[PDB]
Amino acid sequence: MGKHWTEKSLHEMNERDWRILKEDYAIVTKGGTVENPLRNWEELNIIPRDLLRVIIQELRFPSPTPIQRITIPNVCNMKQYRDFLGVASTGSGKTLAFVIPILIKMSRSPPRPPSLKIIDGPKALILAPTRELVQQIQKETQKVTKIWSKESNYDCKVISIVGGHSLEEISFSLSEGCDILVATPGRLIDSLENHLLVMKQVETLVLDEADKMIDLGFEDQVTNILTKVDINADSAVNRQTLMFTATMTPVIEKIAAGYMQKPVYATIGVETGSEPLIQQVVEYADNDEDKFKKLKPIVAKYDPPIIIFINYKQTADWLAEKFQKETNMKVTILHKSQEQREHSLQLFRTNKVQIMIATNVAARGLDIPNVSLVVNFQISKKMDDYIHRIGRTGRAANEGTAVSFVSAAEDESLIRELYKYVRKHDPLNSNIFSEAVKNKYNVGKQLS
Amino acid sequence: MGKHWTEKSLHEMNERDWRILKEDYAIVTKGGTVENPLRNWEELNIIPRDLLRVIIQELRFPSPTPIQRITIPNVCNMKQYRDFLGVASTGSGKTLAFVIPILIKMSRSPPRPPSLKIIDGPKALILAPTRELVQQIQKETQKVTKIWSKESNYDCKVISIVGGHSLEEISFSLSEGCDILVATPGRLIDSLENHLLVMKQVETLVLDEADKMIDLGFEDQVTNILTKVDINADSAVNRQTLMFTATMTPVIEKIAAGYMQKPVYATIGVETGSEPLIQQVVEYADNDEDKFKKLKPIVAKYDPPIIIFINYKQTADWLAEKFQKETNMKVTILHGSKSQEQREHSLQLFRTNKVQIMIATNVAARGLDIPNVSLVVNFQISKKMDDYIHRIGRTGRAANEGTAVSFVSAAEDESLIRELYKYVRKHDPLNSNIFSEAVKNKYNVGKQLSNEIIY
Ligand SMILES: Nc1ncnc2c1ncn2[C@@H]1O[C@H](COP(=O)(O)OP(=O)(O)NP(=O)(O)O)[C@@H](O)[C@H]1O
Ligand SMILES: [Mg+2]
Ligand SMILES: [Mg+2]
Numbered sequence: 001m002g003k004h005w006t007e008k009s010l011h012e013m014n015e016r017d018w019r020i021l022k023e024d025y026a027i028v029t030k031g032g033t034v035e036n037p038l039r040n041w042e043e044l045n046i047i048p049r050d051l052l053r054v055i056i057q058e059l060r061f062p063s064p065t066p067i068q069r070i071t072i073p074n075v076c077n078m079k080q081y082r083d084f085l086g087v088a089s090t091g092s093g094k095t096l097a098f099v100i101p102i103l104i105k106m107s108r109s110p111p112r113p114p115s116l117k118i119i120d121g122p123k124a125l126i127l128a129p130t131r132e133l134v135q136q137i138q139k140e141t142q143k144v145t146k147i148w149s150k151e152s153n154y155d156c157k158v159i160s161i162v163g164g165h166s167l168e169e170i171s172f173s174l175s176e177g178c179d180i181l182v183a184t185p186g187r188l189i190d191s192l193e194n195h196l197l198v199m200k201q202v203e204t205l206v207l208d209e210a211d212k213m214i215d216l217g218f219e220d221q222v223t224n225i226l227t228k229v230d231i232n233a234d235s236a237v238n239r240q241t242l243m244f245t246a247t248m249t250p251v252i253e254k255i256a257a258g259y260m261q262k263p264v265y266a267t268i269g270v271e272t273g274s275e276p277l278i279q280q281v282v283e284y285a286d287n288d289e290d291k292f293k294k295l296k297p298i299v300a301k302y303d304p305p306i307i308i309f310i311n312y313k314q315t316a317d318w319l320a321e322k323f324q325k326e327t328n329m330k331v332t333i334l335h336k337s338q339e340q341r342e343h344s345l346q347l348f349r350t351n352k353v354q355i356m357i358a359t360n361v362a363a364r365g366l367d368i369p370n371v372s373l374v375v376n377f378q379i380s381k382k383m384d385d386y387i388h389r390i391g392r393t394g395r396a397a398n399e400g401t402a403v404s405f406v407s408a409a410e411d412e413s414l415i416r417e418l419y420k421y422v423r424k425h426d427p428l429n430s431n432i433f434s435e436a437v438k439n440k441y442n443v444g445k446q447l448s
Numbered sequence: 449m450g451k452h453w454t455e456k457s458l459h460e461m462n463e464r465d466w467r468i469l470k471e472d473y474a475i476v477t478k479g480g481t482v483e484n485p486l487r488n489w490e491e492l493n494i495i496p497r498d499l500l501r502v503i504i505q506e507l508r509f510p511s512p513t514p515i516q517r518i519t520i521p522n523v524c525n526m527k528q529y530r531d532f533l534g535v536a537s538t539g540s541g542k543t544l545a546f547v548i549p550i551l552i553k554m555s556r557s558p559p560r561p562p563s564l565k566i567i568d569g570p571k572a573l574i575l576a577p578t579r580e581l582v583q584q585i586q587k588e589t590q591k592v593t594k595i596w597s598k599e600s601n602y603d604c605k606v607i608s609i610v611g612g613h614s615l616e617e618i619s620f621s622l623s624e625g626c627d628i629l630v631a632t633p634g635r636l637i638d639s640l641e642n643h644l645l646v647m648k649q650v651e652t653l654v655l656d657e658a659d660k661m662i663d664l665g666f667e668d669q670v671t672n673i674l675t676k677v678d679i680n681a682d683s684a685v686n687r688q689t690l691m692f693t694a695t696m697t698p699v700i701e702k703i704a705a706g707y708m709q710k711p712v713y714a715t716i717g718v719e720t721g722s723e724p725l726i727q728q729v730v731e732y733a734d735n736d737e738d739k740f741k742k743l744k745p746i747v748a749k750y751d752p753p754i755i756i757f758i759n760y761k762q763t764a765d766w767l768a769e770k771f772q773k774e775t776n777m778k779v780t781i782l783h784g785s786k787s788q789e790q791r792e793h794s795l796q797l798f799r800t801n802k803v804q805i806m807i808a809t810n811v812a813a814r815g816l817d818i819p820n821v822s823l824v825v826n827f828q829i830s831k832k833m834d835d836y837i838h839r840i841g842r843t844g845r846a847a848n849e850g851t852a853v854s855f856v857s858a859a860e861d862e863s864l865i866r867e868l869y870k871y872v873r874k875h876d877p878l879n880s881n882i883f884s885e886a887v888k889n890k891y892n893v894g895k896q897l898s899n900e901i902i903y
Contacts, residue, residue: 189664
């Protein structure tokens with residue numbers, strides 16, 4: 001029997017219950033002395049009644065998202081205002097995961113008079129990599145703050161600073177001061193350089209999609225901003241730093257290490273991203289004859305262009321022979337064979353020829369058209385190559401199929417990786433991984 | 449003996465004369481096969497008559513500046529359109545130093561019709577860190593190109609792109625084509641990424657105030673642009689690169705290595721490094737008591753060691769008594785007339801924190817091993833700026849953040865306060881320097897309105 005965590009009250013929760021809840025929302029943490037995630041909005045009383053009413057009654061958000069669950073109780077503690085690093089993909093309530101703590105923090109002090117907002121600048125600074133993201137964050141924030149202003153004592157001003165707005169307009173928009181400022185690093189820097197604003201009173205600094213900011217070349221801009229806010233800070237100000245990234249990198253570690261003080265580290269969900277629409281089908285075949293006999297009826301069912309990958313030029317030639325003499329399909333080869341190979345590609349792109357049989361080397365950096373079918377006649381040594389290969393189909397929202405023949409002579413570790421992959425990336429719910437391959441390589445037998 | 453270079457024809461100049469001329473304008477060069485600098489605008493006939501007329505009569509520059517002297521003959525040098533790295537301050541006249549060569553180069557081909565400018569993009573691209581500089585550069589260039597356009601068939605469009613510009617506005621600005629594009633790097637990247645222009649034909653690329661571009665954080669954007677320019681160039685396009693900086697750094701060196709080919713290197717004047725990260729604070733005070741009253745909360749918050757400068761020894765004794773009576777800071781005094789033993793004792797107390805505050809008169813601390821201090825206080829400013837600069841030198845040493853606080857009364861020389869305001873406005877690495885309104889009003893200094901919304 002038992003009693004499930006959703007049936008318990010807070011007191012009754014044990015450590016196994018917390019483990020289960022964390023798994024339930026794919027939250028993984030570390031850093032020591034980590035607060036448990038919210039079970040709901042209400043019970044810890046972290047969120048003040050007015051704000052809570054805005055969230056539950058006005059916006060109708062009955063429950064927190066995972067990232068909000070873990071972020072809010074770790075970032076809201078008058079005790080610590082501890083730093084936070086979250087690894088989570090865009091969306092799923094990330095923005096309010098950090099905007100809610102900023103509001104809570106604001107509501108634990110009397111409202112700043114307007115004149116003071118003008119003299120002192122923002123209490124929160126949010127950095128994001130693009131104008132679009134910045135504007136999206138401002139709107140998502142004002143969604144709450146616009147209502148909150150009508151339902152409480154706080155009149156929160158959200159100003160954004162982005163490319164495409166003159167220094168003059170930025171300066172004008174700052175006329176009634178600012179509580180939360182949202183900016184791209186570049187334009188924020190342009191703004192400081194022209195003395196448009198002071199940031200001596202910033203209590204929460206947020207770095208959102210930090211990996212994307214690094215990717216776009218903003219590392220030095222970001223670290224300059226961090227250093228500048230640290231130096232210019234009023235000494236009575238205590239500043240909390242929050243960082244969100246979809247992935248972890250050496251650069252992100254470097255920044256965390258350099259600018260954050262003993263932070264909570266959390267992973268939330270998995271790294272999201274594009275799923276090619278591919279049916280992966282892995283089948284066992286003893287030798288090249290068996291392979292070809294299984295392949296023949298498959299190609300009969302797929303519209304050209306079709307591509308077949310091999311590893312040895314001899315096998316390519318053999319396979320072309322088989323196709324030419326045993327079906328009515330026109331092929332073309334690719335090694336180390338042609339420099340005018342773009343002739344062949346041109347045959348293929350225009351459907352003069354239906355099947356291309358190519359090695360990895362020969363086909364890398366060629367514009368292959370979207371194919372209906374990839375055949376891995378000989379498996380690659382590296383998963384990188386398998387992924388690049390099968391990527392030749394399933395592009396631009398069309399469905400594709402990738403069939404791979406696995407013999408008795410393949411790298412076991414590779415086959416393990418491939419099994420995991422075929423299970424994990426199954427958007428069409430139709431991926432096949434042969435039981436015979438499972439047996440030959442002792443892989444994928446275990447139940448969940 | 450020998451006749452002085454100013455008395456000679458160009459063809460009579462020997463190597464010693466060139467050495468002397470270069471020392472006269474503080475020009476130092478390397479990189480091999482460096483051309484001699486201009487002795488005047490006219491001699492060499494590098495600059496065509498109409499353009500020279502504009503420069504002298506219209507822009508009012510009868511003589512070239514040192515950076516112009518060395519830059520122009522090294523980048524306008526058929527046969528080789530050589531790359532160039534100049535180390536020089538604003539405002540040493542850099543702008544014309546690179547604009548003159550761009551125009552001269554432009555004048556060698558027929559004007560392009562707008563449709564073709566659009567198809568191929570600018571012939572010259574100039575990068576600068578701020579809107580203010582980009583707009584300056586565009587204005588200076590346009591003074592010439594306006595004239596060139598009215599008085600000849602050369603329409604030559606000089607477009608600026610800055611961070612503040614919407615894609616709409618950039619589009620409209622680019623709508624009749626562009627010959628010289630002056631841009632901030634981030635926004636240039638946004639423009640390219642949105643297909644607002646191309647860059648197949650950039651023959652001259654100028655990176656102005658490159659050290660500042662790096663300091664603001666733009667190294668990757670600049671690199672990305674250099675790369676894109678080089679990648680999209682037509683085959684027959686030779687791209688000449690000029691880079692100007694106020695200081696030399698390993699990053700600048702690295703960019704020169706990666707993106708320039710056998711450049712001429714030149715330094716004008718005494719090369720300086722980065723500015724000490726000192727915050728300078730100038731504050732008003734009616735008298736000494738009031739100075740001390742403002743000083744109490746200040747020395748309460750800065751970590752020892754702290755150094756305080758005065759002009760008269762009597763003031764040192766006074767100050768020391770007040771520190772003893774009103775603070776918990778212990779002090780040592782150098783007034784100038786103690787033994788080297790005593791002065792070394794004092795200095796030892798100071799270095800080992802047995803005392804927190806050293807009080808020194810104008811030259812009592814010169815030549816001694818004063819540790820880096822967190823705070824320098826000018827209790828009585830010196831009569832001369834040299835001493836001010838020397839004193840604030842005691843802080844912000846070795847890449848540290850430093851603070852210098854000066855109190856002025858109404859008894860100072862007005863010209864000194866004027867110089868001081870200039871110095872405090874000019875040297876503000878941290879954009880945090882404070883020059884009190886009280887001092888401004890009392891001396892009628894720094895009260896000139898800019899007549900600009902932003903500047
Ligand atoms: N706890 C919550 N419960 C329900 N919905 C929420 C919660 N938090 C946020 N949302 C909303 O769920 C939607 C999807 O989340 P998310 O993608 O993060 O928002 P967003 O993309 O930043 N804002 P938007 O572009 O207007 O959809 C948004 O409209 C959020 O405001
Ligand atoms: Mg969304
Ligand atoms: Mg770097």
